[PDB]
mmCIF file of C-alpha atoms and ligand atoms in Angstrom:
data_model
loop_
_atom_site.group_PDB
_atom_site.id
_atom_site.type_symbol
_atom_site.label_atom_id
_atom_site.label_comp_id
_atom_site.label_asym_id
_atom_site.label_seq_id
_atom_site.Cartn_x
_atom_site.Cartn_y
_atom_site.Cartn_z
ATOM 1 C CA UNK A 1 -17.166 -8.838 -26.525
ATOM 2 C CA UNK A 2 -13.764 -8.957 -24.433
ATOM 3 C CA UNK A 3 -11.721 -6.743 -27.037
ATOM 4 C CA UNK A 4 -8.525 -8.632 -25.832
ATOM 5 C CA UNK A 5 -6.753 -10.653 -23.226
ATOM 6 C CA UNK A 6 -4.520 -8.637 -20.938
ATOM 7 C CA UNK A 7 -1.643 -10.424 -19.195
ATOM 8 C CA UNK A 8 0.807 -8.915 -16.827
ATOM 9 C CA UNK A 9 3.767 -8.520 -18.864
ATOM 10 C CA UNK A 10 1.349 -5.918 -21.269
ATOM 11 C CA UNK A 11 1.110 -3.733 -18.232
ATOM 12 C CA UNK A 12 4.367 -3.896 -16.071
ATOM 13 C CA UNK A 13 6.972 -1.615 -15.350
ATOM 14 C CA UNK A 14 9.886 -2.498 -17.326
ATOM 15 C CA UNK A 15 13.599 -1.263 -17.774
ATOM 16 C CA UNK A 16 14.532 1.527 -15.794
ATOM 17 C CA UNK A 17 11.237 2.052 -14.310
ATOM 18 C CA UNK A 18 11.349 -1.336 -12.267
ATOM 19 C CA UNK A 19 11.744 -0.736 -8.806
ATOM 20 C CA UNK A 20 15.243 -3.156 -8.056
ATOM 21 C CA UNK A 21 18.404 -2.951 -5.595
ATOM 22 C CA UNK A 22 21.273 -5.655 -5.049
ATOM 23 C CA UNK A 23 21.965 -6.944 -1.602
ATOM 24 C CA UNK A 24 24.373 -4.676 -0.801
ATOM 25 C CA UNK A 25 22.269 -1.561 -0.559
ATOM 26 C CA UNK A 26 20.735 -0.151 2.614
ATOM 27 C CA UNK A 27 17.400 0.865 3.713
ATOM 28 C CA UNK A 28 18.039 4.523 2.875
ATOM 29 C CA UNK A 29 19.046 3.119 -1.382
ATOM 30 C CA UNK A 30 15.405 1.089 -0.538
ATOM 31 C CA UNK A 31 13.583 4.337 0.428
ATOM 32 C CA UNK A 32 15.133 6.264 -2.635
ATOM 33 C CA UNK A 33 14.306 3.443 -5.290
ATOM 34 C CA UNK A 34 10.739 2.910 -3.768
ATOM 35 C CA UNK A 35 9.984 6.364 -4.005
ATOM 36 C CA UNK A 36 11.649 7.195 -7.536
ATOM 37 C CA UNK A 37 9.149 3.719 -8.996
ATOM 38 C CA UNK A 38 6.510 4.736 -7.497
ATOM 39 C CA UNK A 39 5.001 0.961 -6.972
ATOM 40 C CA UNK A 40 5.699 1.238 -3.141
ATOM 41 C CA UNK A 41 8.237 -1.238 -2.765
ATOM 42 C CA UNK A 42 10.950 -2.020 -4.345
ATOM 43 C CA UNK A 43 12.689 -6.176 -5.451
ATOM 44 C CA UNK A 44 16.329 -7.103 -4.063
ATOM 45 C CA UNK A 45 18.380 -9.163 -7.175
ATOM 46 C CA UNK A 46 21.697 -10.874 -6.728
ATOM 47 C CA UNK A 47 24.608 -9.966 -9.336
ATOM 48 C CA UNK A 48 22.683 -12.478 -11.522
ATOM 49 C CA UNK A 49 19.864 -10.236 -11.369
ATOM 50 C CA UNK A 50 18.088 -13.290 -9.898
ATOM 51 C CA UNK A 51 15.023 -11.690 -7.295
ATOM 52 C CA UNK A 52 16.079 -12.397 -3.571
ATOM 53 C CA UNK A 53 13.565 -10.722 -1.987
ATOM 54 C CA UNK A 54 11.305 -7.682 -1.685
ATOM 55 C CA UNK A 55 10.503 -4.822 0.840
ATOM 56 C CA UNK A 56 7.822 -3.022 1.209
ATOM 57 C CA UNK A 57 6.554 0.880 2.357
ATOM 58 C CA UNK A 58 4.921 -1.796 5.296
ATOM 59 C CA UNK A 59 7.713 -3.628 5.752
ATOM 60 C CA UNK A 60 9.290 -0.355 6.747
ATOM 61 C CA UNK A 61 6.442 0.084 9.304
ATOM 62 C CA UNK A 62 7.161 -2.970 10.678
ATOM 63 C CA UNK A 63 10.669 -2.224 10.556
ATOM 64 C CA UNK A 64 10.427 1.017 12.600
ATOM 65 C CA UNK A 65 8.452 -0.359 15.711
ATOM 66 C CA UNK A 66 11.761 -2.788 16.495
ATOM 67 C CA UNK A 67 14.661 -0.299 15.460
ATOM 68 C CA UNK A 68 15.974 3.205 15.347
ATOM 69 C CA UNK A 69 18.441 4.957 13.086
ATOM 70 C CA UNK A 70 17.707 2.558 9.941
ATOM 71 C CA UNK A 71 19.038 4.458 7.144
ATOM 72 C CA UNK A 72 22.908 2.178 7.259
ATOM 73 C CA UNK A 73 20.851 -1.104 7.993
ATOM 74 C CA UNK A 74 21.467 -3.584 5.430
ATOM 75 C CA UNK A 75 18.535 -4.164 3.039
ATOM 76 C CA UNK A 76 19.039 -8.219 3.699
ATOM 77 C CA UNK A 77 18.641 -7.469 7.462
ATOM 78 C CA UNK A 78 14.629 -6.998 7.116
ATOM 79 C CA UNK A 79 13.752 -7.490 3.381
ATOM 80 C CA UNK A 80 10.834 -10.352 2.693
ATOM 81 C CA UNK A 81 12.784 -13.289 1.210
ATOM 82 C CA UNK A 82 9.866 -15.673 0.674
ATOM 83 C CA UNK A 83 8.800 -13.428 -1.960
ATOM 84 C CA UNK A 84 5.709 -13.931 -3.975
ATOM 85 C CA UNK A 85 6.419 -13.581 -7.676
ATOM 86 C CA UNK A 86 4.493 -13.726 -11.205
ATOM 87 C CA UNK A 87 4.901 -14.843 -14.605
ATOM 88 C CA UNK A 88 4.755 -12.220 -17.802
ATOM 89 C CA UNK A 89 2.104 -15.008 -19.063
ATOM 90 C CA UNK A 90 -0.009 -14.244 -16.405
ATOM 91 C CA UNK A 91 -3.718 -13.070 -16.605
ATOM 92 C CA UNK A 92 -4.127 -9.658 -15.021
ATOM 93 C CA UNK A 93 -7.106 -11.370 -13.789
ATOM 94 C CA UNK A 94 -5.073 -13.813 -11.862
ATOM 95 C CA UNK A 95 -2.701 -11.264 -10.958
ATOM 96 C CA UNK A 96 -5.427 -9.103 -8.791
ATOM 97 C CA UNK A 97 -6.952 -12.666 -7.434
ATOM 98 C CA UNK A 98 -3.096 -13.590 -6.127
ATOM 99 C CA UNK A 99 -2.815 -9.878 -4.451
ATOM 100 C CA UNK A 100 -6.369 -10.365 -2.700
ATOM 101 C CA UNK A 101 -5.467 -14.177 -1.616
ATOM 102 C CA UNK A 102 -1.705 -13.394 -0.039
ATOM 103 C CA UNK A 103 -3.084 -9.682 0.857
ATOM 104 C CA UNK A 104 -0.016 -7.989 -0.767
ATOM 105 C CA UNK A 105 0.138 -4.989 -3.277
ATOM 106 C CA UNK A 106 2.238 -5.462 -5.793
ATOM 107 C CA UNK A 107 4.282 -7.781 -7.739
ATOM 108 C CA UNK A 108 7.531 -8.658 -9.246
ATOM 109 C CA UNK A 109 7.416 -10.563 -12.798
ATOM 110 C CA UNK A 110 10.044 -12.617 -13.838
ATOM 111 C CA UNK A 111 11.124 -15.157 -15.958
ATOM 112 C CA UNK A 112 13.601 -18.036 -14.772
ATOM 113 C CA UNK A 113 14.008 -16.507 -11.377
ATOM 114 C CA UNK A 114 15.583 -12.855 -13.415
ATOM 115 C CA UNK A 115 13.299 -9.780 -12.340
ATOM 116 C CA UNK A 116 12.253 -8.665 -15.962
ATOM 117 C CA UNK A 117 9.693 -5.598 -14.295
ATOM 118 C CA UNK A 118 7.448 -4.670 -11.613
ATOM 119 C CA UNK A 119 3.578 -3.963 -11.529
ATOM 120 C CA UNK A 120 1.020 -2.531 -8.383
ATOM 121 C CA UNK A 121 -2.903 -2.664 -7.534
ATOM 122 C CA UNK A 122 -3.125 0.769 -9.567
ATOM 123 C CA UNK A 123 -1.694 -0.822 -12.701
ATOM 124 C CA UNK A 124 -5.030 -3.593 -12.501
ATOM 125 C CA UNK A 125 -7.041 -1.060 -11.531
ATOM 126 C CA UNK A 126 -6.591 0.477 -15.252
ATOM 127 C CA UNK A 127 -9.504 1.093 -17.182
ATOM 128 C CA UNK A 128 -10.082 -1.792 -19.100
ATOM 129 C CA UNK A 129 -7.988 -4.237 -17.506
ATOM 130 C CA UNK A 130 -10.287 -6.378 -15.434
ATOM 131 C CA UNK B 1 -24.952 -10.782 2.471
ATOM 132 C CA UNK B 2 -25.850 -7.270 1.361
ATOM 133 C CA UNK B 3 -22.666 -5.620 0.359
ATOM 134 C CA UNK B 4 -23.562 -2.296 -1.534
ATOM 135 C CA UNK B 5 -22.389 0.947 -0.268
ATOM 136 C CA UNK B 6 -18.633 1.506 1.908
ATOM 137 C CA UNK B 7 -20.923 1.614 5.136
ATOM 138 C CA UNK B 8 -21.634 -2.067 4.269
ATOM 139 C CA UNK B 9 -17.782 -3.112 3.758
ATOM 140 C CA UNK B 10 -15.708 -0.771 5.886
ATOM 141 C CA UNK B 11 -14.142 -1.746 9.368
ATOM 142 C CA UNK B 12 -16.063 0.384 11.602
ATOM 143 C CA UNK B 13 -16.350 1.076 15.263
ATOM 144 C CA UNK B 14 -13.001 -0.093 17.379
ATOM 145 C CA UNK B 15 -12.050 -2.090 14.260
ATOM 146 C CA UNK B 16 -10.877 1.490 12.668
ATOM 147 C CA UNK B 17 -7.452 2.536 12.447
ATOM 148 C CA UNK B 18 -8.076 5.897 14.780
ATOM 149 C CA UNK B 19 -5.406 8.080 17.197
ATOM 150 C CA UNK B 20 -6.297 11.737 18.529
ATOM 151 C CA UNK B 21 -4.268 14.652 17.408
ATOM 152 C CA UNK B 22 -2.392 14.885 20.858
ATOM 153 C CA UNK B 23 -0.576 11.036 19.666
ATOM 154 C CA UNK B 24 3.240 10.632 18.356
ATOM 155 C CA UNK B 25 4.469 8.827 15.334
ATOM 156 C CA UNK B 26 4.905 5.528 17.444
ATOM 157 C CA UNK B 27 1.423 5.369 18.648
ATOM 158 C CA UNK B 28 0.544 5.694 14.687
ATOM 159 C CA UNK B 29 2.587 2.840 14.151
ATOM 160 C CA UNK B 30 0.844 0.292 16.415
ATOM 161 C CA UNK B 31 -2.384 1.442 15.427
ATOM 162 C CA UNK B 32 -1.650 0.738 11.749
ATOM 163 C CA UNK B 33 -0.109 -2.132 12.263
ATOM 164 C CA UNK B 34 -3.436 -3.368 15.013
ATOM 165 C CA UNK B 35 -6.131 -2.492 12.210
ATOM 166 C CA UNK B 36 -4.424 -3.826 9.099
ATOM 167 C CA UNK B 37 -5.038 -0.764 6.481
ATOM 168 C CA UNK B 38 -1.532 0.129 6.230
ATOM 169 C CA UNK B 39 -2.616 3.722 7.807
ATOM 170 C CA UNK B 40 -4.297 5.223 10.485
ATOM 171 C CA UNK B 41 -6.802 8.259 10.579
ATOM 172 C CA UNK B 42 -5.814 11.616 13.198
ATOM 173 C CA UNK B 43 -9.338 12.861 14.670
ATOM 174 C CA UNK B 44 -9.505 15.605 17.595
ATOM 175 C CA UNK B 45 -11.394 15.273 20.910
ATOM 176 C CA UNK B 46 -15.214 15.180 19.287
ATOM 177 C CA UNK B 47 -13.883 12.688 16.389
ATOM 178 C CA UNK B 48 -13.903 14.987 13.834
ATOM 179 C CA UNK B 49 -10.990 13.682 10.830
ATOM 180 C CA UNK B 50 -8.041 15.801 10.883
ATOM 181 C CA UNK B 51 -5.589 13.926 8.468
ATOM 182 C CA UNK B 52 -4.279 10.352 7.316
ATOM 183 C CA UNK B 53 -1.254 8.599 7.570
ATOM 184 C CA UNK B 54 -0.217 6.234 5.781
ATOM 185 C CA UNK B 55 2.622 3.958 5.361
ATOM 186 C CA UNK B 56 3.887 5.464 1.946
ATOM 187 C CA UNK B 57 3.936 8.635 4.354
ATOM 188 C CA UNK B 58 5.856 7.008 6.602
ATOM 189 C CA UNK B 59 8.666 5.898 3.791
ATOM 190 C CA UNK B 60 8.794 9.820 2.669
ATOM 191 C CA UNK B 61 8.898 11.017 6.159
ATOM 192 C CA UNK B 62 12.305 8.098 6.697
ATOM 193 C CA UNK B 63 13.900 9.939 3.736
ATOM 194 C CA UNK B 64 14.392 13.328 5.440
ATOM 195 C CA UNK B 65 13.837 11.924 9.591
ATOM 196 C CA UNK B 66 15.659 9.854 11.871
ATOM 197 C CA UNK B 67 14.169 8.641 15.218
ATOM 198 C CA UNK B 68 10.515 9.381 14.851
ATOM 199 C CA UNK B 69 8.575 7.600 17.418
ATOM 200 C CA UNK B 70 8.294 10.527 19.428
ATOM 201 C CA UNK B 71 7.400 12.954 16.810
ATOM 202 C CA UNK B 72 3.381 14.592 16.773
ATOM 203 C CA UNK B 73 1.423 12.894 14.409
ATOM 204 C CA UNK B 74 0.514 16.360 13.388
ATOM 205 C CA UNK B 75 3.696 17.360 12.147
ATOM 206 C CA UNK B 76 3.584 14.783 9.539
ATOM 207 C CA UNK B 77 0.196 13.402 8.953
ATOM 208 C CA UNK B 78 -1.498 14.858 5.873
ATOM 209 C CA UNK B 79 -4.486 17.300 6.824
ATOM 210 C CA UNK B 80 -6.049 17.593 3.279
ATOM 211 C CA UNK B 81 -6.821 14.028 2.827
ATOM 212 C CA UNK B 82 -9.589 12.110 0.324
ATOM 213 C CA UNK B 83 -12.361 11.278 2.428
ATOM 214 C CA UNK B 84 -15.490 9.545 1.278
ATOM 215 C CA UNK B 85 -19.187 9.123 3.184
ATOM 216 C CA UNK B 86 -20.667 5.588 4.203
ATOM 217 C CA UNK B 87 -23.630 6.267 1.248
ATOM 218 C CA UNK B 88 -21.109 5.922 -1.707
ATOM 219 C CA UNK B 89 -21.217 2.806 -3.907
ATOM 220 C CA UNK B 90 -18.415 0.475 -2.797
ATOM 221 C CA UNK B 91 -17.607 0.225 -6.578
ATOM 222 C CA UNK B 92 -17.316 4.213 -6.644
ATOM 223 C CA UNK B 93 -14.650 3.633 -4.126
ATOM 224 C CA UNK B 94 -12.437 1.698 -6.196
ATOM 225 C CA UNK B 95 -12.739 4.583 -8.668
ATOM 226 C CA UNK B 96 -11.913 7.371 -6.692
ATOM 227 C CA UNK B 97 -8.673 5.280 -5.034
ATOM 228 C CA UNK B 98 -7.167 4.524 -8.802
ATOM 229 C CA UNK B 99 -7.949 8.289 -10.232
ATOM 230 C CA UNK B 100 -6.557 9.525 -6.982
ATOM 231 C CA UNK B 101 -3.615 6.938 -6.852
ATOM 232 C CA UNK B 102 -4.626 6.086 -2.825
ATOM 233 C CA UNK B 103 -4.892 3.100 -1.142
ATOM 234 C CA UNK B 104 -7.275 3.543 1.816
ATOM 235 C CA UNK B 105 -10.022 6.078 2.668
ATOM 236 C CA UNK B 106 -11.388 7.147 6.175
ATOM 237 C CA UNK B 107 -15.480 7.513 5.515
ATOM 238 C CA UNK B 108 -17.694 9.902 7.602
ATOM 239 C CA UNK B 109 -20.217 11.798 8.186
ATOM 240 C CA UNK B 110 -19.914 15.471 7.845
ATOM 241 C CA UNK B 111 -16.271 15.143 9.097
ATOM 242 C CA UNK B 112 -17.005 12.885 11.775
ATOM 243 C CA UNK B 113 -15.054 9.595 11.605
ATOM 244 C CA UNK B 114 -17.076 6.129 11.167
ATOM 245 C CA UNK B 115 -14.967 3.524 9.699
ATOM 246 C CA UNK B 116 -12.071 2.912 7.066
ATOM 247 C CA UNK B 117 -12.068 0.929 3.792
ATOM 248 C CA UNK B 118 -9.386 -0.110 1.178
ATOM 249 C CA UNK B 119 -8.780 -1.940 -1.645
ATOM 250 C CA UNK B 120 -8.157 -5.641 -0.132
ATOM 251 C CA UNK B 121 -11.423 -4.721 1.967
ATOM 252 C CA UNK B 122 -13.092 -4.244 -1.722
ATOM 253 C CA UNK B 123 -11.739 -7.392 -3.363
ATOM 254 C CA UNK B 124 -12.669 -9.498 -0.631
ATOM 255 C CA UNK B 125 -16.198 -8.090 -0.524
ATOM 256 C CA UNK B 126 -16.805 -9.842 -4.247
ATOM 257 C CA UNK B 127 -16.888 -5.787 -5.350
ATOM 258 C CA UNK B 128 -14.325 -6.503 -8.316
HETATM 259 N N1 CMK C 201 5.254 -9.620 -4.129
HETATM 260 C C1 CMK C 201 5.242 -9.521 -2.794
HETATM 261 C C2 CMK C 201 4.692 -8.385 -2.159
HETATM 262 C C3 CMK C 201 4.725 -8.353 -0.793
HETATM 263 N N2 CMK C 201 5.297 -9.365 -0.081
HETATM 264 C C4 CMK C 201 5.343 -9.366 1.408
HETATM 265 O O1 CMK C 201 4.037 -9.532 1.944
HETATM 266 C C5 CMK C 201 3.957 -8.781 3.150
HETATM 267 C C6 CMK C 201 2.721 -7.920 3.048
HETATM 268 O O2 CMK C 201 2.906 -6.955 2.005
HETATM 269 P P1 CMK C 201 2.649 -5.404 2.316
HETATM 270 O O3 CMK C 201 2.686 -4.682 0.964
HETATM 271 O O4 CMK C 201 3.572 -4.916 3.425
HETATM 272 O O5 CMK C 201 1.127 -5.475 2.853
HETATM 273 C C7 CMK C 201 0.384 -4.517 3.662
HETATM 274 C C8 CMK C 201 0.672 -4.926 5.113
HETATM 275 O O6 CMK C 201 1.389 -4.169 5.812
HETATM 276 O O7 CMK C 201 0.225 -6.027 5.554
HETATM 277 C C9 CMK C 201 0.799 -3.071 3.400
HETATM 278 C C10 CMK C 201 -0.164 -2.005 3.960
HETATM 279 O O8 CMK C 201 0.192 -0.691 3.408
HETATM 280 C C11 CMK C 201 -1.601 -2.396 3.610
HETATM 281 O O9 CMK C 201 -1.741 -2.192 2.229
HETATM 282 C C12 CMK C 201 -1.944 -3.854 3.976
HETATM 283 C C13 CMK C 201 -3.294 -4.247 3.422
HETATM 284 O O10 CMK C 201 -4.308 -3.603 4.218
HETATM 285 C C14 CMK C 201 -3.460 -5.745 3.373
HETATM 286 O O11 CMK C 201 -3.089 -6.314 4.629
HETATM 287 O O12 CMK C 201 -1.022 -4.697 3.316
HETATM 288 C C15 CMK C 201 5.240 -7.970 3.345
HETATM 289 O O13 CMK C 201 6.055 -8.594 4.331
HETATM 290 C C16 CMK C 201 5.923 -8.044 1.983
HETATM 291 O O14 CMK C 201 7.357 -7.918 1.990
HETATM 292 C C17 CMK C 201 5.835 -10.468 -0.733
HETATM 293 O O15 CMK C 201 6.275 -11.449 -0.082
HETATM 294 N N3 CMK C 201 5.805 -10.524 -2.072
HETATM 295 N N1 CMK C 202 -7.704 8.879 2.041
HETATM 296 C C1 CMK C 202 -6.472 9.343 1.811
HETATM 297 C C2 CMK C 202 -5.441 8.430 1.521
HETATM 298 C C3 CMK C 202 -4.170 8.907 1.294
HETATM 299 N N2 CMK C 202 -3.960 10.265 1.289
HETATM 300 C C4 CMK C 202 -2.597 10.745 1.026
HETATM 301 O O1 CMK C 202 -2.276 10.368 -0.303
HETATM 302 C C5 CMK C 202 -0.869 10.291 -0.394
HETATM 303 C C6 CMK C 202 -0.698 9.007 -1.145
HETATM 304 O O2 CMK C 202 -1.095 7.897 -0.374
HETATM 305 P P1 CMK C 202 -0.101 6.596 -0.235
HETATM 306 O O3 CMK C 202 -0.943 5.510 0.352
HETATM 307 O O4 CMK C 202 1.122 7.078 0.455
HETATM 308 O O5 CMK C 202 0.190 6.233 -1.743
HETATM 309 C C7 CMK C 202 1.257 5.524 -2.343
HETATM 310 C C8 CMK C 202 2.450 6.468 -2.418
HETATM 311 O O6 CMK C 202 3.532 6.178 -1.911
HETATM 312 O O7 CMK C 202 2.321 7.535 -3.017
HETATM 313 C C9 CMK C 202 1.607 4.217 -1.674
HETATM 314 C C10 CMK C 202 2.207 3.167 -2.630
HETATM 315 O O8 CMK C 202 1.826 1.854 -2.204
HETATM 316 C C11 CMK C 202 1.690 3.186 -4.044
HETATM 317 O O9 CMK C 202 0.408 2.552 -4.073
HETATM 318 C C12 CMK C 202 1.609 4.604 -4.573
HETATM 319 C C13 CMK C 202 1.050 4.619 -5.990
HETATM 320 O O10 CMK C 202 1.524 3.431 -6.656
HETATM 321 C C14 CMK C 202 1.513 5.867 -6.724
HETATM 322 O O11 CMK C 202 0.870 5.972 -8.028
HETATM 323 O O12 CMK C 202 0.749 5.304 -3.658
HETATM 324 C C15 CMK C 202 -0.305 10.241 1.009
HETATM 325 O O13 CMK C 202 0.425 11.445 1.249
HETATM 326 C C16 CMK C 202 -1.530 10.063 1.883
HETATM 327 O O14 CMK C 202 -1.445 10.650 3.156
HETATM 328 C C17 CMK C 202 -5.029 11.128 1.496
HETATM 329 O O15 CMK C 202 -4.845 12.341 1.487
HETATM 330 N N3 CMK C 202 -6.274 10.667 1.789
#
């Protein structure tokens, strides 16, 4: 039988492993913080640590076919504001069906608006997960 | 209706994210962006793969590069990339892009470049 029920929160990126900026950084703090997570994209909080918005590896794509010389753009000049987030008490199972649906790659979790972590495709892709 | 193998799910013929090893960075980025994969393959002259790009590629090349778009895709693309044939089991390709932490393969045959696949392609297929 189904050994156990796996929800988001079990699997997330958590503490300093969340991929998260405030709104004053740039694109170049984006780049760094997406590529030291490793999840591809990185959330944008306010000083409440509220989530404002994300931005992704193809937001940067998108980015770079309208501008030049990025690195001092501000991160609220082109981050995703309409951000689509998760619960911790989430299904996994839901999780993946939300990703396929809004054809995005990865998630921020939060509770009351504050980011609490972070997870990707990869992480429900995990053997045993789905 | 019959949705086994990657030849059965992958975007093939002009729906394949495709330049030629002569192209620059910005005629990567409207290919990408055109086919929907978040990357593009490089093939030379007979269509034989040379490399991938992808946009996580992209986001490393923007940490150590400024003004790109008229860069050779061949200076940045990368030339040892995961490719997979059309006869694998489209559940075999989910495997090999979470052991190999990828998000998109370019299938051929014997090096020659017939399509693209990735994970959204997968999930929409009914394949998990
Ligand atoms: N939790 C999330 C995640 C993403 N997004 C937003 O949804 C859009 C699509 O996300 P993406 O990660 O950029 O999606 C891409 C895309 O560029 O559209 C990335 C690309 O590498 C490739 O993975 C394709 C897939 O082929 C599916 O289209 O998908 C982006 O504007 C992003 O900021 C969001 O609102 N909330
Ligand atoms: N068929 C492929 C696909 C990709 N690659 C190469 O594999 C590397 C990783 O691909 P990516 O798509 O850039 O992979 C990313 C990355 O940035 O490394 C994107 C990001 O969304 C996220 O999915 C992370 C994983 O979360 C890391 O575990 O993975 C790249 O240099 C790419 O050129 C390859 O050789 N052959």
């Amino acid at each position: 039988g189904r050994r156990l029920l796996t929800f988001v929160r079990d699997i997330m990126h958590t503490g300093d492993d969340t991929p998260v900026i405030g709104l004053e950084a740039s694109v170049r703090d984006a780049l760094l913080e997406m590529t030291a997570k490793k999840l591809g994209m990185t959330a944008i909080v306010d000083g409440a640590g509220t989530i404002q918005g994300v931005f992704t590896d193809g937001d940067l794509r998108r980015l770079l076919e309208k501008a030049q010389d990025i690195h001092a753009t501000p991160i609220t000049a082109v981050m995703t504001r309409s951000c689509v987030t998760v619960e911790g008490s989430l299904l996994a199972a839901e999780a993946v069906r939300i990703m396929e649906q809004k054809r995005i790659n990865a998630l921020p979790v939060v509770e009351n608006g504050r980011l609490i972590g972070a997870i990707n495709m990869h992480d429900l892709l995990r053997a045993g997960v789905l």
